[PDB]
Design a protein around this ligand. Structure first.
Ligand SMILES: [Zn+2]
Length: 70
């Protein structure tokens, strides 16, 4: 209904519909995306700050490295 524990992100125009958990979109997350110029916009329709755990890892991936570990 108006309530819906799902994401608030948009990627390339696909309004993310993955289920939302403990993950959210604080004013600190923004700067990590701005410094990376990703296609990750914000759904103002539900006017909420929840994200799916798939997107939670994505913004945490840009702080890591594509080089694997032992
Ligand atoms: Zn998402």
């Amino acid at each position: 209904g108006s309530y819906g524990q799902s994401c608030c992100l948009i990627e390339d125009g696909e309004r993310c519909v993955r289920p939302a958990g403990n993950a959210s979109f604080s004013k600190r997350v923004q700067k990590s995306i701005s410094q990376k110029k990703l296609k990750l916009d914000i759904d103002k329709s539900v006017r909420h700050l929840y994200i799916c755990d798939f997107h939670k890892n994505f913004i945490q991936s840009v702080r890591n490295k594509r080089k694997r570990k032992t």
